[PDB]
Ligand binder design. Structure first.
Ligand SMILES: O=C(O)[C@@](O)(COP(=O)(O)O)[C@H](O)[C@H](O)COP(=O)(O)O
Ligand SMILES: O=C(O)[C@@](O)(COP(=O)(O)O)[C@H](O)[C@H](O)COP(=O)(O)O
Ligand SMILES: O=C(O)[C@@](O)(COP(=O)(O)O)[C@H](O)[C@H](O)COP(=O)(O)O
Ligand SMILES: O=C(O)[C@@](O)(COP(=O)(O)O)[C@H](O)[C@H](O)COP(=O)(O)O
Ligand SMILES: [Mg+2]
Ligand SMILES: [Mg+2]
Ligand SMILES: [Mg+2]
Ligand SMILES: [Mg+2]
Lengths: 99, 438, 440, 99, 438, 440
């Protein structure tokens, strides 16, 4: 099973994930974290980990939430999202962790 | 009232006229007949595309020609600017726009060659049009695909292949990582390949590839047919089978039937790929015809979800067309053939589609040009892979994702395009092979 | 292999004559082969799935080249039955934008009889139309209402009334008059038909108005056709190129069901049928028009304000009216064309013509044609009724002269001057436009 | 039978008609003359007497055409019209002569 | 993001904002709750009629509130000017406009009283509306009536009369010279007077009066009913009988059903009289409600052919409403309650209707006020004539025609109104009698 | 004669209580008589055709006056069966603009049983609705999605998902959210129902979303209702005043045919039901709403951001839910109202409420009501799911306390504080909005 963007590349390291988060922030978008144990074509609403981090100022703050979500949900897929409120749509979504 | 023939210029050339924000504006490149002044040729185009004819008529004085007439208000070089009052046009009808702007004026003896370069559709008229039935944002939501260009490919041979097998090629492409595949523009229903058979077996392949990969898939099923009723029938069947997409050749089918399919598509929840077959009959020559950017505007107004934009005609020209399809406001830039500013009045954006003999080596340039919001089509670039469609699809998918990753990391994907692809090829045998072939 | 000079075309083959301007360095033989491949089966790289088929059954073949003209044959099974849309998608779908050609013009097309039989042709046809009108032995008179736009529905129909009662057989909406703020279609349709009925009762001759149903969607066009039929109109009108062939086919089917005769305006044709180096020659468009089913189509005037060659126009009229048209290089007819019993289409000559052109027009077209006088009717010094009388009389005087054995070209002016002695309206028209000539 | 505007007043004299024509001209409208022997609810297109007098500069010029129409068609109803081309509609219509 | 309650003013009061030509503008007369600043009350109206609520929500940051929010951009006296972006509204839906502008904001504790005075409908939004199905010019063409106001009258008693007799009153009114007659707004289908019976016998009277007089006639048959389907049924029957008119109480039936009847009316070729029953529930008080001029704008946008305008509320107020209904552009004039300029973007004009206890003595004033393009209704002013409806209709018709004649001749119909009527009365006994009665 | 203090109203009469502010110099008795005449038969001058009838059978009569309140009785035969539109046209059609009254408010109306039987009432009703939801013994939880406008369809349904899975029974479109460029209705309807099904499966409780079908024409509203039913939605929503009663009746009929429950938003009501001197009291609008057939209607909160009196609201809830409501001057109920077996309507309390208001809300409404928390759900410090849990828990804790015999007003804060000990979401909501009070 693939999980869309970047799922055809090798699994991302934490430093690669962090650079994607920096790309989200540098462009003024809102990073978010979601997780599910049931990925697939019929699931368009993964579980929110907290809320989209509107107040995050650094990529490391997001990475700390990722590690906390990863520790809390070790048997779930976990993805990073990037939301553009001017576009009213996600501009980036990729799985950061796989069970 | 005085009967007789007067120069068009006396009534339809007005260089003092100040265009209104509600006026529809046209930029015509005019080659007059030798001996015919430019002002007279331009006034003839304005007259015979609005209210006038070749001789004065008593009935002219029964209406308000100062209000209704089109006016050439500026001639710069060989470009005539003509303003058309809003009241001249039927709301929501691209067909009416064409019947006036390009109806007869291209065939006048007094004008040896005529090319419509650009058109300023006023905001008040744009709001009478529905725009794309889906739009980029909603389409990405329906697909659950964010952060990269989307990949497609035409199932080949163009004409010749049978149904359950035609669908095996679809299955292989989609299970290899392409998001979509498509019918050829001239594949409708033919003795070698009837539409009901193709629709049924193509969709079995789509459901299978989607279940195995876990990613949402689609096939642009061509509903183009000889009548509007037949096209609507084929769209209904595509929807009944759960297809997310249909496809129409919007120029060969025509705008009136195009509008009918666009309405039904939105009602049925289908996304509408628009193939621009025949466009080069209109838009190829720089001295006569209609430039594609005008066709693209009409396309976004009626409502298509994607339209082909070519490969790279010219780079400046293509960037202008991509902006016209995707942005909410596009400033003028005659360097890109944009003679007017274009406000899109909130109409949804259209996906540009790059297609035509492209393969893995072009991905860095394509990402740099278009960014995330575009479709990259690999027709023969998928089936022609050494190990078949499946492996070719994987090579193309990896190439796009690898380049997007590098871009997001801050790398210069143009100067490092080669290095990026070779890095990704070290962990993807399919990509390494594809790069060797082409 | 896509160039095969030893291939003999089949009677079932669809044939095309392309004028090719290849990219520099691309020889004619290879450019023709490329057009044949891209308009049939060919791809740009080898594909594994090609081995699961027999492409030879579907390949198009260039079988003859002379100069910059390539003759290409297409198997019958390549095309969807009864769909002009499919023909265009294949024959003119991508080969005009291909890189290896700089310019391309489709000059002619041989529609095989076996493909023609999948089309219904005109819903009425010349013979049945003349029967419905009870008009035999002369060209029929018409005219576009002017100004093109701006008249109210009621004043619009006043002009219709004056034209028809003065001797015109028909009048028509301008191609760009559909439904607009100054003139909505329901208002126009009602008032126009009041005028048509009034002029018919007062003159004793059957009348008609070509009510334009052209609209933004097929459904809207069908609605307007329904209303025209409910009013008893003998005619509707459609811009078949701007509306498009798919919606045109839908309107043609409905027209036959409702008993409506269908006038077809070729608006937009000059965008791509004008220049000799690129596009689609109108004679091809005329064949497609007759296949789908138009009762009339504009063909040009030769002598009017819009461009048109006399020899090419003679061939196009034959293509629209005859059951078999042999090839004729002098008229640009590259192929023999059998029409498989399809009904014939009225050619329509319109655009910048007036009384002095009638001898030429009768000479070119003969009786089976419509002559439209818009500005040449309303522009009469005394208005539309007098202008209509002048045009009707000029046409009848010339037809009479021809039938009596006179050379209407050599005696054209004399014939008009004779008729003018008994028709002051014609005399005044001849005086006004005596010095208004266009280049031929 | 009545004929709409002014038909419920006594028949107009030529001086009254002329004043109506002056009203049409003073407001920049186009005076016209029409006539019919079949007035009624089903007739919305009377016969034109010449064309609408776009070039008329004085009411007397119109009155001379009225007298000529009246002499030529003594057994017809004859009405004066006033047309406003900015409005695209008649702004005044009344019968000037009855048979 | 910070949860909690913030003053509306911080986000929805922006005195630096410059309204766009595409913005919809409102002028609200605001009476704040004592202790609530005017800026906060105005911002609350803007917030709760566009995007905001009473406390900050995390989802606010999922959209572009700078683009979508309404903004109070000016407060002058007790009038708040608020601008609404075009994207907030559904094309062609008066119902949507109401649901935002007047949906909830009139009931907030922080705003003690609120009155919507005027609204600037932008040209780009007006073009999504069809306007009147007929319009003044086309209506006059259908009637063949030019150069005078048109006359009507309500058949009375309001409720009580039977069918074949109700129609005898219609016959008498129309054969006496009235152009039209009408149903009372509350005459629909009742045990005393069922609609099918009334429609059948009223139309027999219309055909008869039209044949005898030679002038085209009509009756405004009320199709108002409990459901949209029932109203459409009654409109179909009216059309089947050859009626030129139907009538709807557009406020009591409602705008959604009004829009449905307006569409069917145009399809059937019916002209649509609109009765404003219930308007005073909304528009009577100067401190709270919606002024009628706003209702009149919505009426012209949906598409009514006539609407009542009152008798003379105020003269300045009525002249403003008449302009809003008939002109293509109406400049602002707060003296007449017009706070904005209103461009009508080519929508057809509406006939104003003056009704309410008027008789022959009012005709000079009515002609001076309205000119030719209006309906004058004489309900009891026709049936209450000493010799019945027929003679009353003749008196009213003569009075209008006589005054129009004098005006066209250059006479001052205000200073000579009395003299003009007495002159005409010398040759019309009906007029002389009517003047004596009232 | 239109004032008759000796007239005894019939059980078939329709009765009205008007508060009249007459024009100065117009005495109350004469103003009441004028209202009765103009709302029934009367004219302004004698007419010959009045003698062909028996108007006494149709006259309305003012039969009692106290202070500035006039009681007027209308015969049953004055009104069209089953048409609220007709009631309004007669009762509030012209008498509010009449010159002899300066202001006029309709306070109450006695709908006679014989007229009620011509109406169908709610399509579902409280009892059947609770059966369809399988929810008994507590007020039901809902909430409007915020921002009112601006969210995409997919993000809009994300908020729906978070709300429903957190414990809300329903969510709803804002009254002004119909179909707009940023959020078209078909997109919203599809994504919302995906969220509804998802939350229902994950929680095990039946869910719903009040999809707004309000549109510019009846036909469009019916189309949107059809699509909601095709998606399996249990609910649709309509703004019955802005859309209007005629189109509302059409939607209600279709809703029953399709099996849809019908939420009714009273947008625009405050334009004319707010001021005590002029308009129509909401209790009258509530009666009309129950007659046509709404399953819910907003009634106000008393304690929230929008105005509403506690006593009047108590009477309105009884008018919506009971089969017989006796007159009660303390609550502004001027007449006894029998409901002739019509189904009852859910009152809905919405607007600026949060957890601290739940004791008051339960005390006012009891179990048969919806409590809507829009800002009070999404405004929770941790978002919509936590907010929904806080509101659901507060409602259940208060219901439990009441059922156990506690005075939920006297112990309201204590009850919430007890529940908060086991529900951190409630604790956080209580802390955030602890100082947010409105005037009562
Ligand atoms: O038929 C074809 O050539 C394609 O399927 C491409 O095939 P490959 O991907 O195998 O080349 C597309 O239709 C063209 O690219 C469209 O041309 P345009 O962009 O001119 O519309
Ligand atoms: O719009 C016009 O110009 C006409 O109405 C001619 O008006 P006049 O009769 O006043 O010239 C016709 O549509 C053209 O002749 C069409 O051109 P073609 O027939 O070549 O398609
Ligand atoms: O019922 C009535 O009073 C009328 O029939 C007038 O009767 P008369 O002509 O016999 O007075 C009209 O409906 C009102 O004038 C409308 O009031 P508005 O102008 O307020 O809509
Ligand atoms: O638009 C609004 O304000 C609401 O969504 C409340 O949102 P919050 O829950 O965020 O306050 C409701 O429509 C109002 O309560 C209706 O007023 P009523 O119920 O009085 O008709
Ligand atoms: Mg293709
Ligand atoms: Mg034309
Ligand atoms: Mg009335
Ligand atoms: Mg709301």
């Amino acid at each position: 099973m693939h999980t869309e963007t970047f799922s055809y590349l090798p699994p991302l390291t934490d430093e690669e994930i962090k650079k994607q988060v920096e790309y989200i922030l540098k462009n003024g978008w809102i990073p978010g974290i979601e997780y599910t144990d049931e990925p697939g074509p019929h699931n368009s609403y993964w579980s929110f980990w907290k809320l989209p981090f509107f107040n995050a100022e650094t990529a490391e703050e997001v990475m700390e939430e990722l590690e906390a979500c990863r520790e809390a949900n070790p048997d779930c897929y976990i993805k990073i999202t990037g939301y553009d409120n001017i576009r009213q749509g996600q501009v980036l979504s990729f799985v950061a962790y796989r069970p | 009232y005085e009967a007789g023939v007067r120069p068009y210029r006396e009534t339809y050339y007005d260089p003092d006229y100040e265009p209104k924000d509600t006026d529809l504006l046209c930029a015509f490149r005019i080659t007059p007949k030798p001996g015919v002044p430019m002002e007279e040729a331009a006034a003839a185009v304005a007259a015979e595309s609005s209210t006038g004819t070749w001789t004065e008529v008593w009935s002219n004085l029964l209406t308000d020609l100062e209000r209704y007439k089109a006016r050439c208000y500026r001639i710069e070089g060989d470009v005539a600017y003509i303003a058309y009052p809003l009241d001249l046009f039927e709301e929501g009808s691209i067909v009416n726009i064409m019947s006036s702007i390009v109806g007869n004026v291209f065939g006048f003896k007094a004008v040896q060659a005529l090319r419509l370069e650009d058109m300023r559709i006023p905001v008040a008229y744009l709001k009478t049009f529905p725009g794309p039935p889906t739009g980029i944002q909603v389409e990405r939501d329906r697909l659950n695909k964010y952060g990269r260009p989307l990949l497609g490919g035409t199932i080949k041979p163009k004409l010749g292949l049978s149904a359950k097998e035609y669908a095996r090629v679809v299955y292989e492409c989609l299970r290899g990582g392409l998001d979509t595949t498509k019918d050829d523009e001239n594949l409708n229903s033919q003795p070698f390949n009837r539409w009901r058979d193709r629709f049924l077996y193509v969709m079995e392949a789509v459901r299978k590839a989607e279940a195995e990969t876990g990613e949402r898939k689609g096939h642009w099923l061509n509903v183009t047919a000889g009548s509007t009723e037949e096209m609507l029938k084929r769209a209904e069947f595509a929807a009944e089978l759960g297809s997310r997409y249909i496809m129409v050749d919007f120029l060969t089918a025509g705008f009136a039937a195009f509008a009918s399919v666009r309405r039904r598509a939105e009602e049925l929840g289908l996304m509408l790929h628009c193939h621009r077959a025949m466009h080069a009959v209109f838009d190829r020559q720089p001295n006569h015809g209609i430039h594609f950017r005008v066709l693209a505007k009409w396309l976004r107004m009626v409502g298509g979800d994607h339209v082909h934009t070519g490969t790279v005609g010219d780079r400046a020209e293509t960037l202008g067309i991509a902006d016209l399809l995707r942005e909410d406001y596009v400033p003028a830039d005659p360097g890109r053939g944009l003679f007017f500013d274009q406000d899109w009045a909130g109409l949804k954006p259209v996906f540009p589609v790059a297609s035509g003999g492209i393969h893995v080596w072009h991905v860095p340039d394509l990402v740099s040009i278009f960014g995330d919001d575009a479709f990259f089509l690999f027709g023969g670039g998928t089936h022609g892979h050494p190990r078949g469609s499946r492996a070719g699809a994987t090579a193309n998918r990896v190439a796009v994702e690898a380049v997007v990753q590098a871009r997001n990391e801050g790398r210069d994907i143009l100067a490092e395009g080669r290095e990026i692809l070779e890095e990704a090829a070290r962990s993807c045998p399919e990509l390494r092979e594809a790069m060797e072939l082409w």
